[PDB]
Amino acid sequence: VSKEELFTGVVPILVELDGDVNGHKFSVSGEGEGDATYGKLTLKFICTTGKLPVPWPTLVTTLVQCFSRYPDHMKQHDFFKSAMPEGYVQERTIFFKDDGNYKTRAEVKFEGDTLVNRIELKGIDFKEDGNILGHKLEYNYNSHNVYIMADKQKNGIKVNFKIRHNIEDGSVQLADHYQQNTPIGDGPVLLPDNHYLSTQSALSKDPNEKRDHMVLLEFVTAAGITLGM
Ligand code: NA
Ligand code: NA
Ligand SMILES: [Zn+2]
Ligand SMILES: [Zn+2]
């Protein structure tokens, strides 16, 4: 039921996102590679419609948890890989405290040797001069724990966590994330015991790139379950 064999080695990744936030329409493409044995991602994203209308860090969680490293004793809890190659739908609602929300739907699946994440994002209720549309977020990311449980009603998982976005005046903008994942295929999947992913992300710029872009490295390992339990 585990699909670890698809994830051997380095796997190319493609990402495509169409988004509309307070009627500002935009698109983002990304390409890179993942190594689930190490739990590491490297990707570069470009805004193909001009300047991104929201800050890049707000799109990090939207823009492939199947590349998480699952420990030796936790292979029976890896839902994300178990749903491949047909893949899973990942839906979120993200509430930015004192501001608007994003709602997202994505399909993550293999197209051949490439892992692809295809996303629609709709943003509503943002303040024109808030931290988001105001572009008051620093260009950086912090470490978070992403809590995963099995869905008690359907074949799938329920996931929640709270992202801290640091603001240029020293304050912090919180983004509460609520997430569900369901398989696309009707094959068996792994429905995990409660656990979490320890997430770290670092953002940078390619000094030669003139398009609006984001270079992103991530390291993710699952944790939280006692051997054999
Ligand atoms: Na199998
Ligand atoms: Na605007
Ligand atoms: Zn172990
Ligand atoms: Zn158990």
Numbering used by the authors: 1 to 3, 5 to 64, 68 to 233
Which statements did the authors publish about this structure?
Here, we have applied a transposon-mediated directed-evolution trinucleotide deletion (TND) approach (Jones, 2005; Simm et al., 2007) to the commercially important and widely used enhanced green fluorescent protein (EGFP), an engineered variant of the original Aequorea victoria GFP. EGFP is an important tool in cell biology (Tsien, 1998; Zhang et al., 2002) but still has some limitations resulting in further protein engineering endeavors to improve properties such as stability, folding efficiency, and solubility during cellular expression. Using directed evolution, enhanced green fluorescent protein (EGFP) was observed to tolerate residue deletion across the breadth of the protein, particularly within short and long loops, helical elements, and at the termini of strands. Only correctly folded EGFP variants bestow the fluorescent green phenotype on E. coli.
The overall structures of EGFP and EGFPG4Δ are very similar with backbone and all atom root-mean-square deviations of 0.6 Å and 1.2 Å, respectively, suggesting that deletion of G4 is having a subtle effect on structure, predominantly at the local level. In EGFP, G4 is located in the first organized structural element, a 310 helix, which is relatively distant from the chromophore. Deletion of G4 results in a significant local rearrangement of residues in the 310 helix and the helix itself. K3 rotates by ∼120° around the axis of the 310 helix to reside at the position previously occupied by G4. First, rotation brings the K3 side chain into the vicinity of the cis peptide bond between M88 and P89 with the NZ group being within hydrogen bonding distance of the backbone carbonyl O of M88. Second, the shift in the 310 helix to accommodate the K3 side chain repositions E5 and generates a new polar network. The carboxylate group of E5 is now within electrostatic bonding distance (2.7 Å) of the NZ amine group of K79 in the adjacent 310 helix, which in turn is within hydrogen bond distance of the backbone carbonyl group of Y74. This new polar bond network absent from EGFP now links different secondary structure elements in EGFPG4Δ. Folding analysis revealed that EGFPG4Δ retained more structure upon unfolding and refolded with almost 100% efficiency but at the expense of thermodynamic stability.
